[PDB]
Amino acid sequence: YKRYCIISRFKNNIDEFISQSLKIAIKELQNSCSSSLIHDYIRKIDVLLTSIDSA
């Protein structure tokens, strides 16, 4: 229900903590409707993850 936005926000705070990244690749991929229904700050929140992944 409303937990699809919470767990995405829970994975957003957990991906900022940095194999283990391969399980993180499952959280970052397979977009069916979560990368279509969601807000305007979540787009730059995805940019903060890959730049942190660039380190």
Q: Going by C-beta distance under 8 Å and a sequence separation of 6 or more, which residues neighbour residue 24? A: 15
Pick from 12, 4, 10: nearest CA to 43: 12
CA distances (Å), origin 55, targets 6, 18, 48: 26, 9, 11
Ramachandran area for residue 51 (φ above 0: left; ψ -120 to 50: alpha; else beta) = alpha
Structure tokens, 1:
């229900």
The Cα 52–Cα 31 span in angstroms is 21
The Cα 50–Cα 55 span in angstroms is 9
Q: What is the resolution of this structure in A?
A: 4.0
Give the method used. Answer: cryo-EM
Distance of CA 41 to the CA centre of its chain: 12
Structure tokens, 7:
């767990």
The Cα 16–Cα 46 span in angstroms is 10
The residue type at 42: I
